[PDB]
Amino acid sequence: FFILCLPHPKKINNVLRAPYSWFVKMWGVGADPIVVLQSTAGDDRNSKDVFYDKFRTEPNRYKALFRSSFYNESRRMNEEK
């Protein structure tokens, strides 16, 4: 990474930070056994009073969803970037 910016580091890093941030978001989303940290809070989706349980794994429900054309188009735009 340091060799690539070193020509023009303020311009290279501003356009290479987008596929580096996108890679960490969409990493472990497609695997079939998914390990989560089981949490519990209020009925509202914005409740902050959360209680944590131990780790566990669960089968992914969205396994076949990532065969779509939304992600396949979104991945080649990031490989272009």
Binding site: A18, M26, V36, R45, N46, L65, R67, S68, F70, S74
Partner: protein, 81 residues
């Protein structure tokens, strides 16, 4: 302005592909929206048409939201860095 756009987001999804993608939360901050929804089908064709009607609502408002910037994922969240 994100609230007036985001309320037009839920209408066209409810009027072209009804019964899918019920909305449960609406968080609007500076230059960001965050919809906590749940998806009612793991389909390759139907989800490809629901995800197309979201971009057609923003583009027919005037803005240009990139498909590489838009996030539609089950197990990842970014909100205010």
């Amino acid at each position: 302005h994100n609230m007036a756009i985001g309320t037009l987001m839920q209408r066209e999804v409810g009027r072209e592909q009804p019964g899918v993608l019920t909305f449960l939360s609406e968080q609007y901050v500076g230059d960001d929206t965050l919809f906590y929804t749940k998806l009612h089908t793991t389909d390759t064709k139907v989800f490809d048409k629901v995800a197309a009607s979201i971009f057609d609502t923003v583009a027919k408002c005037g803005h240009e939201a990139s498909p590489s910037k838009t996030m539609m994922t089950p197990y990842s969240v970014e909100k205010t860095q």
